[PDB]
Design an enzyme around this catalytic site. Structure first.
Site, mmCIF file in Angstrom:
data_model
loop_
_atom_site.group_PDB
_atom_site.id
_atom_site.type_symbol
_atom_site.label_atom_id
_atom_site.label_comp_id
_atom_site.label_asym_id
_atom_site.label_seq_id
_atom_site.Cartn_x
_atom_site.Cartn_y
_atom_site.Cartn_z
ATOM 1 N N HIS A 151 0.801 -1.222 0.000
ATOM 2 C CA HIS A 151 0.000 0.000 0.000
ATOM 3 C C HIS A 151 0.847 1.292 0.000
ATOM 4 C CE1 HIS A 151 0.075 0.164 4.532
ATOM 5 N NE2 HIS A 151 -0.106 1.455 4.312
ATOM 6 N N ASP A 174 -0.013 -7.511 2.107
ATOM 7 C CA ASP A 174 0.452 -6.132 2.069
ATOM 8 C C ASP A 174 1.963 -6.091 2.238
ATOM 9 O OD1 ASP A 174 0.404 -3.415 1.865
ATOM 10 O OD2 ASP A 174 -0.522 -3.055 3.828
ATOM 11 N N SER A 226 3.323 3.127 8.004
ATOM 12 C CA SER A 226 3.091 2.078 7.011
ATOM 13 C C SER A 226 4.416 1.540 6.497
ATOM 14 C CB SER A 226 2.298 2.638 5.829
ATOM 15 O OG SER A 226 1.004 3.066 6.235
ATOM 16 N N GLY A 227 4.533 0.217 6.436
ATOM 17 C CA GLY A 227 5.691 -0.407 5.820
ATOM 18 C C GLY A 227 6.823 -0.645 6.799
HETATM 19 C C1 LIG Z 1 -2.001 4.128 5.107
HETATM 20 C C2 LIG Z 1 -3.297 3.367 5.262
HETATM 21 C C3 LIG Z 1 -4.115 3.049 4.066
HETATM 22 C C4 LIG Z 1 -3.737 3.415 2.663
HETATM 23 O O1 LIG Z 1 -2.811 4.161 2.368
HETATM 24 O O2 LIG Z 1 -4.564 2.846 1.622
HETATM 25 C C5 LIG Z 1 -4.614 3.472 0.350
HETATM 26 C C6 LIG Z 1 -4.377 2.395 -0.692
HETATM 27 O O3 LIG Z 1 -4.699 2.923 -1.983
HETATM 28 C C7 LIG Z 1 -5.346 2.269 4.192
HETATM 29 C C8 LIG Z 1 -4.975 0.883 3.748
HETATM 30 C C9 LIG Z 1 -5.648 0.244 2.708
HETATM 31 C C10 LIG Z 1 -5.303 -1.053 2.321
HETATM 32 C C11 LIG Z 1 -4.268 -1.736 2.975
HETATM 33 C C12 LIG Z 1 -3.945 -2.935 2.631
HETATM 34 N N1 LIG Z 1 -3.637 -4.020 2.336
HETATM 35 C C13 LIG Z 1 -3.586 -1.109 4.013
HETATM 36 C C14 LIG Z 1 -3.939 0.187 4.392
HETATM 37 N N2 LIG Z 1 -5.693 2.012 5.584
HETATM 38 C C15 LIG Z 1 -4.901 2.326 6.626
HETATM 39 O O4 LIG Z 1 -5.291 1.985 7.761
HETATM 40 N N3 LIG Z 1 -3.738 2.991 6.481
HETATM 41 C C16 LIG Z 1 -2.971 3.256 7.639
HETATM 42 C C17 LIG Z 1 -3.197 4.321 8.499
HETATM 43 C C18 LIG Z 1 -2.382 4.474 9.621
HETATM 44 C C19 LIG Z 1 -1.344 3.572 9.891
HETATM 45 C C20 LIG Z 1 -1.124 2.496 9.034
HETATM 46 C C21 LIG Z 1 -0.039 1.487 9.328
HETATM 47 F F1 LIG Z 1 0.386 0.811 8.278
HETATM 48 F F2 LIG Z 1 -0.594 0.620 10.144
HETATM 49 F F3 LIG Z 1 0.992 2.055 9.923
HETATM 50 C C22 LIG Z 1 -1.943 2.346 7.918
#
Ligand SMILES: CC1=C(C(=O)OCCO)[C@@H](c2ccc(C#N)cc2)NC(=O)N1c1cccc(C(F)(F)F)c1
Ligand SMILES: *[C@@H]1O[C@H](CO[C@@H]2O[C@@H](C)[C@@H](O)[C@@H](O)[C@@H]2O)[C@@H](O[C@@H]2O[C@H](CO)[C@@H](O)[C@H](O)[C@H]2NC(C)=O)[C@H](O)[C@H]1NC(C)=O
Ligand SMILES: *[C@@H]1O[C@H](CO)[C@@H](O)[C@H](O)[C@H]1NC(C)=O
Length: 218
Positions: free
Chosen positions: A41, A88, A173-174
């Site tokens: 993502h 992911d 993320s990541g």
């Molecule tokens: C950052 C993001 C998304 C996001 O960019 O999607 C846009 C995709 O086009 C969306 C999401 C959608 C699908 C997947 C999967 N497979 C994972 C996340 N949902 C989501 O919760 N976050 C998010 C917010 C805060 C912290 C974090 C973490 F990674 F945990 F650090 C993640």
């Protein structure tokens, strides 16, 4: 990271910052001198030729000689399914090989299929948001978290901080989840906003993908 603390400089030398012209947007983990892994993502809908892979960093607000910067040569994916929130994970091959030193090191991964029991103690980390309108961290943050299986799917590793509101957030993320010295998770998603104190944070389960990872980096 919400409710965490500053890491000791270069405590986690496998920790990577993925950056665009605009700066940090995601974490990653150095898994070989010329490969990092991150969340799929993070790179869906991004121009990957623009991504700067920053190793050896601690304080993103300062210029740091300890840093090594690479570009992305190739991407490997493994069935990323944003609708079901599955797989992911992405591996980014760098345009060169990192110089391994005190500040830049490759992480150790778990054995294929190794699950984590309820109650395992881990560290989450990242340069993500510190909380509501506090913006991204300058200094790498870390956070004690606990693996939970409740309110989590079998297709994730989930963690929760009990007794207060703390967790991963945008920009995290990541980033790696370190459990018993091994990278067991890649930060994938939150529910109820960051640090809800209700929903566990969800990570891609690195152990489920180890064979695939090896096929690429070995
Ligand atoms: C950052 C993001 C998304 C996001 O960019 O999607 C846009 C995709 O086009 C969306 C999401 C959608 C699908 C997947 C999967 N497979 C994972 C996340 N949902 C989501 O919760 N976050 C998010 C917010 C805060 C912290 C974090 C973490 F990674 F945990 F650090 C993640
Ligand atoms: C808060 O977390 C730290 C660090 O967690 C450990 O090391 C991480 C890299 C990862 O491998 C986690 O799974 C580990 O649990 C804990 O610090 C450890 O604490 C023990 C026991 O006190 C100590 O003997 C070790 O030396 C510490 N390990 C390291 C690497 O510093 C700490 O216990 C956690 N605190 C709580 C209350 O959960
Ligand atoms: C890799 O990319 C970086 C960042 O643009 C660049 O500085 C370096 O020249 C590249 N290394 C190569 C092509 O070996």
């Amino acid at each position: 990271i919400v409710g965490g603390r500053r890491a000791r400089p270069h405590a986690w030398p496998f920790m990577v910052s993925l950056q665009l012209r605009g700066g940090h947007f995601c974490g990653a983990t150095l898994i070989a001198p010329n490969f990092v892994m991150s969340a799929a993502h993070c790179v869906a809908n991004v121009n990957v030729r623009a991504v700067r892979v920053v190793l050896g960093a601690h304080n993103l607000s300062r210029r740091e000689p300890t840093r090594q910067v690479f570009a992305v040569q190739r991407i490997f994916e493994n069935g990323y399914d944003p609708v079901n929130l599955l797989n992911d994970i992405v591996i980014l091959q760098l345009n060169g090989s990192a110089t391994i030193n005190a500040n830049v090191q490759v992480a150790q991964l778990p054995a294929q299929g190794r699950r984590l029991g309820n109650g395992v103690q881990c560290l989450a980390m990242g340069w993500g948001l510190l909380g509501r309108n506090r913006g991204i961290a300058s200094v790498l943050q870390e956070l004690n978290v606990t693996v939970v299986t409740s309110l989590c799917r079998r297709s994730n590793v989930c963690t929760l901080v009990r007794g207060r509101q703390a967790g991963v957030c945008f920009g995290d993320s990541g980033s790696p989840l370190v459990c018993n010295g091994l990278i067991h998770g890649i930060a994938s998603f939150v529910r109820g906003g960051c640090a809800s104190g209700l929903y566990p944070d969800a990570f891609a389960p690195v152990a489920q993908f180890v064979n695939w990872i090896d096929s690429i980096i070995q």
